[PDB]
């Protein structure tokens, strides 16, 4: 019944999607993007 978490407790950042643990929020929020996106950037793209 809404139990498990006790006061302030470190929160890990796992991506069930693939299964990777990170520390910096940016790593996750950013990583998520990697998943989406295909056939967009080809050869000599800049
Ligand atoms: Zn992932």
From Swiss-Prot:
Q: Where are the zinc fingers (C2H2-type)?
A: 13-35
Q: Which domain of life is it from?
A: Eukaryota
Query: Where does it localize?
Result: Nucleus
Which family does the entry's similarity section mention?
Belongs to the krueppel C2H2-type zinc-finger protein family.
Q: What does this protein do?
A: May be involved in transcriptional regulation.
Q: What name does UniProt use for this protein?
A: Zinc finger protein with KRAB and SCAN domains 5
**Originating organism:** Homo sapiens (Human)
């Amino acid at each position: 019944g809404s139990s498990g978490s006790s006061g302030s407790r470190e929160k890990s950042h796992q991506c069930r999607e693939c299964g990777e643990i990170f520390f910096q929020y940016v790593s996750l929020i950013e990583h998520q993007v990697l998943h989406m996106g295909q056939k967009n950037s080809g050869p000599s793209s800049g």
